[PDB]
Amino acid sequence: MQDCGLPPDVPNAQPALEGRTSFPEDTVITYKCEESFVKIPGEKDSVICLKGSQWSDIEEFCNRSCEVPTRLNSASLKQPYITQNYFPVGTVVEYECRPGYRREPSLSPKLTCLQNLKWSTAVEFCKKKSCPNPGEIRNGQIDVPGGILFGATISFSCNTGYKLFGSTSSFCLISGSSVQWSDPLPECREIYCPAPPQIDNGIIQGERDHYGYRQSVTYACNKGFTMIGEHSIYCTVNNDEGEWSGPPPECRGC
Amino acid sequence: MQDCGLPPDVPNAQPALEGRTSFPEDTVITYKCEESFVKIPGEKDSVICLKGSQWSDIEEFCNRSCEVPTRLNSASLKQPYITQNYFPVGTVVEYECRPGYRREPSLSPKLTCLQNLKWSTAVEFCKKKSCPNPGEIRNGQIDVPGGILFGATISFSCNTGYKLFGSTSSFCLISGSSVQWSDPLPECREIYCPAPPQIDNGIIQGERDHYGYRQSVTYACNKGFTMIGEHSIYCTVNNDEGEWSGPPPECRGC
Ligand SMILES: [Cl-]
Ligand SMILES: [Cl-]
Ligand SMILES: [Cl-]
Ligand SMILES: [Cl-]
Ligand SMILES: [Pt+2]
Ligand SMILES: [Pt+2]
């Protein structure tokens, strides 16, 4: 009926004594690997106090191991590395691209545990996916300030004389399997000036169905009359309504 | 004696006595109609001293006449009115159109000498001839401010994106028998933008031989290069030179 003394001394491991120094038979003491040490899977990490005041045998069960690889935005830890914590020197793990990222063939998606207990240099093996080419807007313009990769933003404009109809911008969002543009290409439609005013005792030289930006209309008085204002007027617009340069000339009189 | 006294007194007429008061037989004295007066055609205007110191008979030979019809630009006196100077009250003359004018049937080409010794009111019996239809200008405009009659002036313009080549105006001048357009219609030629600049590490999507107004050129970076700028630029045509909307997008980098 004798108690057990102090547990055996295990290298790189510290036992949880619970402030005790003597333990009754059938006492199980568990060790915890020291800093930079991860318990070797399948190894005895504890001791029991047996008859004759004797502790059960126990061998070193800790190996200097890497910390769980740091999360990456481009890729994730494949299985089963994604659930492991024991990473002794020489341990290599494999990654798999996230969404929306794509594999850079020329580069390896593997990380190694260096002697110094750190993961080998990180390379861009998982490169950002690139949305389809914007295209082109008829009588409009697309602005790609920072490429068209996953996360980029592009804007749309309408050339002078045209009003934009649709989305004014678009984002390279991730959509399921691949990547796509948030909003669709708008349309740059041609602005039209309201029918040119008609004048008393005068007429419009060759009238047209519609008048667009920079388009003019020339007037002509009737035999025996005179103008009062500009002879012609042109279709203004600016941003983004169609407007005539000014009032129409004037004929008089009789 | 063989002499004559003073010549008979003729109304509205004054005789040329030549400093003398007595005249020897066979002396012929001539009278000159007074102001506002013209001598009657085919009528004696002179007396002769005959035997017995007696002057030959003489009757009034001076009316009472208008003045040579005032010069007009449209019409010209007919024959023989164009050579006459004796125009007593009631005298009516006929005109004939000049070049390039034409008679206006509805109106009479005759002028009368009124009691007040003036010509009846002048009407436009000889109107201005008209010039052929100016026609039209492909991608251009013709400005007819005051009809196209003889003497009129018309201007020519070139629609946006086109440069005028030829006469910028024309006048309806008389061409022998008729009146014709001084100069021939000009040419509305299409302005071209200087060859679109090229960018480093990029290319022009489907380059063209020439670029006209509102025509654009889309750029494309080279693999591994990010396009930073306006995905495309268009050719703005400003009165009246061809210019690119702006700078071309860029490809980085390095
Ligand atoms: Cl692009
Ligand atoms: Cl005017
Ligand atoms: Cl005018
Ligand atoms: Cl681009
Ligand atoms: Pt005018
Ligand atoms: Pt582009």
Curated annotation (Swiss-Prot), chains A, B:
It is linked to Complement hyperactivation, angiopathic thrombosis, and protein-losing enteropathy: An autosomal recessive disease characterized by abdominal pain and diarrhea, primary intestinal lymphangiectasia, edema due to hypoproteinemia, malabsorption, and less frequently, bowel inflammation, recurrent infections, and angiopathic thromboembolic disease. Patients' T lymphocytes show increased complement activation causing surface deposition of complement and the generation of soluble C5a. It comes from Homo sapiens. This protein recognizes C4b and C3b fragments that condense with cell-surface hydroxyl or amino groups when nascent C4b and C3b are locally generated during C4 and c3 activation. Interaction of daf with cell-associated C4b and C3b polypeptides interferes with their ability to catalyze the conversion of C2 and factor B to enzymatically active C2a and Bb and thereby prevents the formation of C4b2a and C3bBb, the amplification convertases of the complement cascade. The chain holds residues 35 to 285 of 381 of the full protein. The keyword Membrane applies. GO terms for molecular function: lipid binding; virus receptor activity. It comes from the Eukaryota. Expressed on the plasma membranes of all cell types that are in intimate contact with plasma complement proteins. It is also found on the surfaces of epithelial cells lining extracellular compartments, and variants of the molecule are present in body fluids and in extracellular matrix. Monomer (major form) and non-disulfide-linked, covalent homodimer (minor form). Interacts with ADGRE5. The Ser/Thr-rich domain is heavily O-glycosylated. Keywords: Blood group antigen, Cell membrane, Complement pathway, Disease variant, Disulfide bond, Glycoprotein, GPI-anchor, Host cell receptor for virus entry, Host-virus interaction, Immunity, Innate immunity, Lipoprotein, Membrane, Receptor, Repeat, Secreted, Signal, Sushi. GO terms for cellular component: cell surface; endoplasmic reticulum-Golgi intermediate compartment membrane; extracellular exosome; extracellular region; ficolin-1-rich granule membrane; Golgi membrane; membrane raft; plasma membrane. Glycans are attached at N63. GO terms for biological process: complement activation, classical pathway; innate immune response; negative regulation of complement activation; positive regulation of CD4-positive, alpha-beta T cell activation; positive regulation of CD4-positive, alpha-beta T cell proliferation; positive regulation of cytosolic calcium ion concentration; positive regulation of T cell cytokine production; regulation of complement activation. This is Complement decay-accelerating factor. Changing R20L: In Tc(b) antigen. Belongs to the receptors of complement activation (RCA) family. The gene is CD55. Disulfide bonds join C4-C49, C33-C62, C66-C113, C97-C126, C131-C172, C158-C188, C193-C235, C221-C251. Residues 3-64, 64-128, 129-190, 191-253 form the Sushi domain.
